[PDB]
Design a protein around this ligand. Structure first.
Ligand SMILES: CCCCCCCCCCCCCCCCCC(=O)OC[C@H](CO[C@@H]1O[C@H](CO[C@H]2O[C@H](CO)[C@H](O)[C@H](O)[C@H]2O)[C@H](O)[C@H](O)[C@H]1O)OC(=O)CCCCCCCCCCCCCCCCC
Ligand code: CLA
Ligand code: CLA
Ligand code: CLA
Ligand code: CLA
Ligand code: CLA
Ligand code: CLA
Ligand SMILES: CCCCCCCCCCCCCCCCCC(=O)OC[C@H](CO[C@@H]1O[C@H](CO)[C@H](O)[C@H](O)[C@H]1O)OC(=O)CCCCCCCCCCCCCCCCC
Ligand SMILES: CC1=C(/C=C/C(C)=C/C=CC(/C)=C/C=C/C=C(C)/C=C/C=C(C)/C=C/C2=C(C)CCCC2(C)C)C(C)(C)CCC1
Ligand SMILES: CC1=C(/C=C/C(C)=C/C=CC(/C)=C/C=C/C=C(C)\C=C\C=C(C)\C=C\C2=C(C)CCCC2(C)C)C(C)(C)CCC1
Ligand SMILES: CC1=C(C/C=C(\C)CCC[C@H](C)CCC[C@H](C)CCCC(C)C)C(=O)c2ccccc2C1=O
Ligand code: SF4
Ligand code: SF4
Lengths: 154, 31, 66, 733, 143, 42, 80
């Protein structure tokens, strides 16, 4: 496949690592009582590990000679779920945060003592402002086009 | 006769001694 | 006929060794006396590294801006 | 005057020991010396260059003499792969009997040192075979250094000293250096390779006494002037060819194969001679560009001033740059250091992947030592280039003569440059450290499969584009019908593809996620060091915190505690802080190189692949793991040949640590301590009869920073050199 | 123009028990400083070098090894005790040099009998760059 | 009450409450969908 | 001996003179401001380079500038 890697579902070292992990987890389980709280916790962890490995095989991740999943970020459409749509999600959230904070700073910049509203957050105004980050992708775009995103005269 | 035996002391003891003495005299006195 | 910008005006600094260089301040008072080369007094809303918000400037160093 | 230093009258009147210190640390800063003029400065620089050439020749002559005298060359050439080359003998009266026993190696009659500079392979490849050749080379070089000193002295004397107008003749100097220093020199090297080295690698021993009686080619110079040059490549050396013997030898003197010599695992000598001849032709042609006394050619300043884009995006373009470069010597030194550092790093990168000396690829410790050597020197050269750029800004820059050209516009938007470079550094550091810590925590919880392993897919694609076929990308050279592949199938691609796809050499190593992460660490280091240096340079002339910095010189302690405090505000201090980052970045580079190569030499590249993704792997599987023989160099049960490194390993740990002293404790404490010490000495019997002559004082602030940095760097270098050499030589694999 | 007071030996020195912070060889071969004041009443003050000393009634004379020490002592005498002081520089040759207050009035108060030294009639931002004063003995600020 | 609100919105207190809420939200998201290395929904 | 310069932006506030710990600065008659005062540096040979004067100057940039220069036993503040 890409970069000489093979799918984890049909890879062999991936399955070997899965088996070894479960064996290691089970080794501890046999020491305690069959149905004690530690035994239940260890069983839950084993089930979690099995579910994790099955999901990794299901999503179609690529596994190297090491038997571990590898992430392709070149832009291949078969792997957009590895970096590109999480990347878009991060960009949206981070722009939300930055736009909300900038809106707060611009809103409080007109008082005689703006610093007072900076060490003591004016929550009433902040609660109204935080929701602009839902549509910041549009507000920032029209802010740039309208030419007042960037401070002229500087 | 062993050439290293003559020179290693010459360059490690005599040379630094004479050089340090001469340079101390040069640096440390009014001209 | 007073000299320099009027009191309460809006001037930007042109002295390149000033903290507020290219910045903006409000004119406080311009001395009518000649023989003084830094008559204009300007107040800023930000302190400098010495925690000072007022400074004197020459007539050519300040420039009335909108 | 009237005492040391004579070049500074202000220092000679200092009544403290400072006069001595600053007397030594400003001897080569001619511009700040009393009664300094233009011609005086240039003549002093010229003579110092002659002195440096003499020193270099003397040093290489000493290497030759010692290898010829206590060396192993005659025995080494008999079996290059199964005998350790000897540098020089040891004569230390402090040695004990077991030390003498342990240090006698290489078939010597006493304790000796095993050379790791790689001079044996280099001298063997070029044609030197016996100790007589080494002795002749040493004598010739001693003569050469003497002649260099004679030239320096001659040009010191009046009536031979060039004027300033001569020094500033850039066009003629460029013409001669391109067509003469570079072109003719490479042409001569190609001549030597054709006349001596290539015959030497085929059995014949061509020397001064018979090189006029031996034809380098059976049809000498007939093909060359007739134009039928292909006759010089008609019979290359067979792939079953032992190096210094005629078994399987050819007659071609120039070729272009591209692979390696199968036995020596190094580049073909004929290919190298052809390379040097070609680039000699290119340099000779290109060195006729500028105008001198013959009425044809170019004037550099006109080319510069004519390169101004319409639309004024670059302002006045390069107008006025010729005069600011020709008159500013620090500008010239900065440009030279920049280019030199770039090509030194290039040498480091190319020497390990395309070895040119026979049997050096099989000498692993030599390869590692040379790579680390050249990388550290390149880092120092780059840091120096930036330092001298800042110095030029402070001293030789004329704002009015550079009005609105590229330099002034660089100065006037310095803040955008610095801020964006800071953003790049922040991004790289944040995400590289985040991924490393994530993987490390993942392995802490026993779930390696949940790591964020990103395939360096772009680099793998580039490798595939070169012809490698381990990633299945099927790109140029790795495809089958691509024009790029088809164009060179009959020249060099056979050998090149044979070498690149061969996976026992270092020609384009296979790469994975660990390589991705470490390369991004490298990028972080480069960007942060560049940030520190660029910020120090562009703000050298002054900033908002100190607008009149240009009047305070390049290096000064501070501006006092006023205005919030102005510690480390000079450009010298910016260089000072950048040296730490340079050391750190080159340390990462060499750690990566050495770990990858030590795991490849063991046929255990997997181990690196697994353990490189997380930092605990670096700490345990590399530093802790490869450091057992070194620390065991000597123990309560005796010592072995590695003890000298084990000692140095500790020595480098001490120096570095004492460096932390001058960097943390500052002047005032030490000054008061020295004051009480002076009182005590003056108040004691029999010793007050002895009186100091320079008043003791604590080290200066700038001097203390410099001494601390020097300790830091010396300890860094010594400890890493000890570790690298002991670990690679401990296994010899 | 204010004849400076002449140093008067025989004046009593303050009561002090001795210290390791006193004079050294520099006073013997180079120079040392002497400060004098009046102090209306006997009282205990903090020495600039060691512990505490007591000022005698009437004139007091103290010899220090540094001018900065004399100034610190004078500042404490002027602000804490409200005493007028003057100090001198004494050379091994036997010379005395009135130092402070130079013209009878302390340097803080403007006096009509002082000339300007090292005063530049321009803002600090109008100094030439180093390149204009290169290879000349002058510095850009000395102009 | 009014002064309690004022002090309860000062930088340190507001920041700690915000980060406690964010930590809880992220913890719950991880708990419901643990061991997530990719975005599979689309 | 360090070099101390007074620039014409001085407003004669006198704060630098109060700060000097070696009596290097002074106040002299002048006519370009309201105080008719300006700082002078007639005794820079006793300057120790502490730059305590610059920390007291309220003008921006400074009106009193200390340029550290050749060091003497007086400038180094040595009592031995
Ligand atoms: C499924 C298919 C259909 C989808 C339809 C979706 C519709 C959008 C989602 C939900 C709509 C219902 C929301 C609840 C109703 C009350 C909201 C409101 O009117 O509440 C009133 C506020 C007022 O809005 C604007 O608020 C701005 C800021 O004012 C104030 O903002 C703060 C308000 O607390 C402070 O008072 C602050 O001092 C002051 O600046 C403007 O200047 C004006 O005051 C006012 O026009 O709306 C606000 O944004 C309150 C914050 C929540 C807004 C949520 C928007 C969606 C994201
Ligand atoms: C810079 C080159 C160089 C270097 C690094 C060394 C290093 C060394 N030499 Mg050596 N040497 C050199 C050149 C060099 N040599 C040359 C050109 C000759 C003449 C052919 C010799 C002849 C020589 C002899 C006979 C011996 C050594 C020996 C030694 C070792 C012990 C110290 C010693 O005896 O001092 C060096 C002794 C000398 C007599 C050197 C004189 C020759 C040069 C011209 C002196 C340079 C002085 C100059 C002012 C400074 C150079 C610039 C800079 C490096 C400071 C030591 C590792 C000893 C040894 O074998 O080790 C066990 C020994 O006995 N050397
Ligand atoms: C382990 C030692 C260390 C570390 C980690 C750093 C890290 C950094 N240095 Mg530095 N430096 C060091 C040693 C170090 N340095 C030394 C010894 C020197 C010689 C004096 C210097 C001199 C130096 C200079 C001159 C400069 C830097 C700069 C920087 C920053 C570059 C920007 C970046 O890479 O993004 C970020 C890198 C990171 C490693 C992230 C650190 C923060 C992580 C995410 C932890 C977050 C906190 C976490 C939530 C836990 C909080 C706990 C709670 C109790 C609060 C960076 C933060 C440059 C700079 O400031 O950038 C503009 C700069 O100019 N360094
Ligand atoms: C600076 C480098 C250099 C130097 C000094 C020499 C010098 C010499 N070469 Mg040589 N050569 C060189 C580079 C060099 N070569 C290179 C790069 C190649 C590879 C193409 C050759 C290939 C070569 C061959 C095949 C032969 C020589 C030969 C010779 C010798 C006689 C050449 C002669 O006079 O014929 C005539 C010279 C001219 C007509 C002048 C040429 C016009 C110039 C460029 C102006 C002579 C000592 C000959 C020999 O017998 O060796 C002893 C011989 O046959 N050379
Ligand atoms: C062709 C290369 C080259 C040249 C010609 C110069 C030339 C110059 N440099 Mg420069 N520099 C260079 C490369 C170069 N540099 C590089 C690569 C760096 C990066 C490190 C620097 C960084 C640098 C700085 C920061 C400064 C200069 C300065 C100067 C000027 C004065 C130097 C002087 O006299 O100080 C005297 C020489 C010394 C103090 C050297 C002695 C101390 C060294 C470092 C100790 C050596 C290490 C130790 C002994 C080895 C270990 C011992 C043992 C355990 C083995 C001078 C014109 C100074 C200047 O004033 O600019 C105008 C200045 O501040 N350079
Ligand atoms: C490895 C790091 C290192 C080392 C070696 C030292 C060493 C020392 N520190 Mg120190 N210190 C350090 C780190 C270090 N520090 C750091 C990082 C800080 C920052 C917090 C401090 C802050 C600090 C303070 C504030 C003070 C010291 C003091 C001292 C000295 C105490 C006197 C003493 O021990 O007598 C003897 C010295 C030693 C035992 C050191 C090793 C000496 C070797 C064994 C002798 C070798 C001689 C050899 C034959 C020489 C021949 C070589 C020839 C070629 C020249 C001593 C020299 C105190 C001091 O100065 O004492 C009054 C002091 O006040 N340090
Ligand atoms: C740049 C650094 C970095 C990056 C990129 C990651 C990335 C990741 N980490 Mg990690 N981590 C890091 C640093 C980093 N970490 C450090 C420094 C530590 C030490 C404290 C940890 C400790 C850590 C642990 C213990 C775990 C992770 C886990 C994860 C993965 C979980 C994704 C998730 O939470 O589901 C998705 C989350 C969301 C979708 C939330 C956003 C949705 C919002 C709220 C709604 C938006 C609506 C529109 C993810 C790939 C988890 C894992 O399972 O790894 C595979 C996990 O167990 N990390
Ligand atoms: C998808 C990712 C890419 C998005 C690109 C968005 C469009 C960018 C082009 C338009 C930018 C723009 O109009 O503003 C251009 C901005 C300033 O914006 C300009 O401001 C002016 C003064 O107010 C006017 O209002 C103009 O209408 C306005 O465009 O300046 C620049 O970015 C320089 C570019 C050349 C102009
Ligand atoms: C500060 C300063 C200075 C300096 C600076 C510096 C030094 C910088 C730098 C820099 C650098 C050091 C850079 C480098 C670079 C490089 C580049 C930019 C490149 C490139 C590219 C290309 C062109 C490529 C090509 C190719 C080919 C050919 C083929 C194969 C592939 C490749 C891609 C490789 C001075 C003194 C002058 C002055 C003042 C200022
Ligand atoms: C696709 C991709 C890639 C790449 C890419 C690239 C390379 C590009 C780019 C890019 C670029 C070239 C960018 C840029 C930019 C620029 C600028 C100039 C900007 C800006 C912005 C701003 C300024 C903003 C601001 C803000 C916001 C909006 C947010 C918040 C608020 C604030 C205000 C902060 C890769 C392959 C890797 C992978 C896959 C994906
Ligand atoms: C120890 C220390 C001192 C005191 C250091 C002194 C007094 C140096 C004493 C060293 C003596 C002279 C022996 C040094 C031996 C050297 C190896 C000799 C080098 C001389 C030539 C070979 C270059 C400072 O003055 C200081 C100032 C500012 C910051 C940090 C410090 C600081 O850490
Ligand atoms: S630096 Fe210190 S001693 Fe010198 S003039 Fe200024 S305040 Fe006085
Ligand atoms: S502190 Fe500055 S403004 Fe005030 S008198 Fe001194 S020099 Fe003038």
């Amino acid at each position: 496949d890409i970069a000489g890697l093979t799918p984890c579902k049909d890879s062999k070292q991936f399955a070997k690592r899965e088996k070894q992990s479960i064996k290691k987890l089970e080794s501890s389980l046999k020491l305690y009582a069959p149905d004690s709280a530690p035994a239940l916790a260890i069983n839950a962890t084993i089930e979690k590990t099995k579910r994790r490995f099955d999901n990794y095989g299901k999503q179609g991740l690529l596994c190297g000679a090491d038997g571990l999943p590898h992430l392709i970020v070149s832009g291949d459409q078969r792997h957009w779920g590895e970096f590109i749509t999480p990347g878009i999600l991060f960009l949206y959230i981070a722009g939300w945060i930055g736009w909300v904070g900038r809106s707060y700073l611009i809103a409080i910049r007109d008082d005689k003592k703006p610093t007072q509203k900076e060490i003591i957050i004016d929550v009433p105004l902040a609660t109204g402002l935080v929701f602009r980050g839902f549509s910041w992708p549009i507000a920032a775009y029209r802010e740039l086009l309208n030419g007042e995103l960037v401070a002229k005269d500087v | 006769i062993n050439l290293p035996s003559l020179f290693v002391p010459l360059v490690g003891l005599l040379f630094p001694a004479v050089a340090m003495a001469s340079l101390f005299l040069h640096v440390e006195k009014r001209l | 006929p007073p000299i320099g910008p009027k009191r309460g005006a809006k001037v930007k600094i042109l002295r390149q060794e000033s903290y507020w260089y290219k910045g903006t301040g409000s004119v406080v008072a311009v001395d009518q006396d000649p023989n003084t080369r830094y008559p204009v007094v300007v107040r800023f809303n930000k302190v400098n590294y010495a925690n000072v918000s007022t400074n004197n400037y020459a007539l050519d160093e300040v420039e009335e801006v909108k | 005057a009237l005492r040391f230093p004579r070049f500074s009258q202000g220092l000679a009147q200092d009544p403290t020991t400072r006069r001595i210190w600053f007397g030594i640390a400003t001897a080569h800063d001619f511009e700040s010396h009393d009664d300094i003029t233009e011609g005086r400065l240039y003549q002093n620089i010229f003579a110092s260059h002659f002195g440096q050439l003499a020193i270099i020749f003397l040093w290489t002559s000493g290497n030759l003499f010692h290898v010829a005298w206590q060396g192993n060359f005659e025995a080494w050439v008999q079996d290059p792969l199964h005998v350790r080359p000897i540098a020089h003998a040891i004569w230390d009266p402090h040695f004990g009997q077991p030390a003498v026993e342990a240090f006698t190696r290489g078939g010597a009659l006493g304790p000796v040192n095993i050379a790791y500079s790689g001079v044996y392979q280099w001298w063997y490849t070029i044609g030197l075979r016996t100790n007589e050749d080494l002795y002749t080379g040493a004598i010739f070089l001693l003569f050469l250094s003497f002649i260099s000193l004679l030239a320096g002295w001659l040009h010191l004397q009046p009536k031979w000293k060039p004027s300033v107008s001569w020094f500033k003749n850039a066009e003629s100097r460029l013409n001669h250096h391109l067509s003469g220093l570079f072109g003719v020199s490479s042409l001569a090297w190609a001549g030597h390779l054709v006349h001596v080295a290539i015959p030497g690698s085929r059995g014949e021993y061509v020397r001064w006494n018979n090189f006029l009686s031996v034809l380098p080619h059976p049809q000498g110079l007939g093909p060359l002037f007739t134009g039928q040059w292909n006759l010089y490549a008609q019979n290359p050396d067979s792939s079953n060819h032992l190096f210094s013997t005629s078994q399987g030898a050819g007659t071609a003197i120039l070729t272009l194969l591209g692979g390696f010599h199968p036995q020596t695992q190094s580049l073909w000598l004929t290919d190298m001679a052809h390379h040097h001849l070609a680039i000699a032709i290119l340099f000779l042609i290109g060195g006729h560009m500028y105008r001198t006394n013959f009425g044809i050619g170019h004037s550099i300043k006109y080319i510069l001033e004519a390169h101004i884009p319409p639309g004024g995006r670059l302002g006045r373009g390069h107008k006025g740059l010729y005069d600011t470069i020709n008159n500013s010597i620090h500008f010239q030194l900065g440009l030279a250091l920049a280019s030199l550092g770039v090509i030194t790093s290039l040498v480091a990168q190319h020497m390990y992947s395309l070895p040119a000396y026979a049997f050096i690829a099989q000498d692993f410790t030599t390869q590692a030592a040379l790579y680390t050597h050249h990388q550290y020197i390149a880092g120092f050269i780059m840091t120096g280039a930036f330092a001298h750029g800042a110095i030029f800004f402070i001293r030789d820059y004329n704002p009015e003569q550079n009005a609105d050209n590229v330099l002034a516009r660089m100065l006037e938007h310095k803040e955008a440059i610095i801020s964006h470079l800071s953003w790049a550094s922040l991004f790289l550091g944040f995400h590289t450290l985040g991924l490393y810590v994530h993987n490390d925590v993942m392995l802490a919880f026993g779930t390696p499969e949940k790591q964020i392993l990103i395939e360096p897919i772009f680099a793998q694609w580039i490798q595939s584009a070169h012809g490698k076929t381990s990633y299945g990308f099927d790109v140029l050279l790795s495809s089958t019908n691509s024009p790029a592949l088809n164009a060179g199938r009959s020249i060099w691609l056979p050998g090149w593809l044979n070498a690149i796809n061969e996976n026992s050499n270092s020609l384009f190593l296979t790469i994975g996620p660990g390589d991705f992460l470490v390369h991004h660490a490298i990028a972080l280091g480069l960007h942060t060091t560049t940030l520190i240096l660029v910020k120090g340079a562009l703000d050298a002339r002054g900033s908002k915190l100190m607008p009149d910095k240009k009047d305070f010189g390049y290096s000064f302690p501070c501006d006092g505690p006023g205005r919030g405090g102005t510690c480390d505000i000079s450009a010298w201090d910016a260089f000072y802080l950048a040296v730490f980052w340079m050391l750190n970045t080159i340390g990462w580079v060499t750690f990566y190189w050495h770990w990858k190569h030590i795991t490849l030499w063991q046929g255990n590249v997997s181990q690196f692949n697994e353990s490189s993704t997380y930092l605990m792997g670096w700490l345990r599987d590399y530093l802790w793991l490869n450091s057992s023989q070194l620390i065991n160099g000597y123990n309560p049960f005796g010592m072995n040949s590695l003890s000298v490194w084990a000692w140095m390993f500790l020595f480098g740990h001490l120096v570095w640590a004492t460096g932390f002293m001058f960097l943390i404790s500052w002047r005032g404490y030490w000054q008061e301590l020295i004051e009480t010490l002076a009182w005590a000495h003056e108040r004691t019997p029999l010793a007050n009869l002895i009186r100091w002559r320079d008043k003791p004082v604590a080290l200066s602030i700038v001097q203390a920073r410099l001494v601390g940095l020097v300790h830091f760097s010396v300890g860094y270098i010594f400890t890493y050199a000890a570790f690298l050499i002991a670990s690679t030589s401990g296994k010899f694999g | 123009g204010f004849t400076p007071p002449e140093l008067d030996p025989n004046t009593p020195s303050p009561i002090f028990g001795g210290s390791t912070g006193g004079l050294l060889r520099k006073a013997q071969v180079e120079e040392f400083y002497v400060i004098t004041w009046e102090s209306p009443k006997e009282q205990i003050f903090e020495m600039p070098t060691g512990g505490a000393a007591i000022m005698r009634e009437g004139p007091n004379l103290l010899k220090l090894a540094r001018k900065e020490q004399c100034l610190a002592l004078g500042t404490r005498l002027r602000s804490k005790y409200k005493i007028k002081y003057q100090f001198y520089r004494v050379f091994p040759s036997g010379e005395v040099q009135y130092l402070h207050p130079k013209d009878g009035v302390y340097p803080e108060k403007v006096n009509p009998g002082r000339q300007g030294v090292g005063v530049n009639f321009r803002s600090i931002g109008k100094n030439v760059s180093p390149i204009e004063v290169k290879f000349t003995g002058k510095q850009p600020y000395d102009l | 009450m009014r002064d309690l609100k004022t002090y309860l919105s000062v930088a340190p207190v507001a920041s700690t409450l915000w980060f406690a809420a964010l930590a809880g939200l992220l913890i719950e998201i991880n708990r419901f969908f643990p061991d997530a290395l990719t975005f599979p929904f689309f | 001996s360090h070099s101390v310069k007074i620039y014409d932006t001085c407003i004669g506030c006198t704060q630098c003179v109060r700060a000097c710990p070696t009596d290097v600065l002074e106040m002299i008659p002048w006519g370009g401001c309201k105080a008719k005062q300006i700082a002078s540096a007639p005794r820079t040979e006793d300057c120790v380079g502490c730059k305590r004067c610059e920390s007291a100057c309220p003008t921006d940039f400074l009106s009193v500038r200390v340029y550290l220069w050749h060091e003497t036993t007086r400038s180094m503040g040595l009592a031995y």
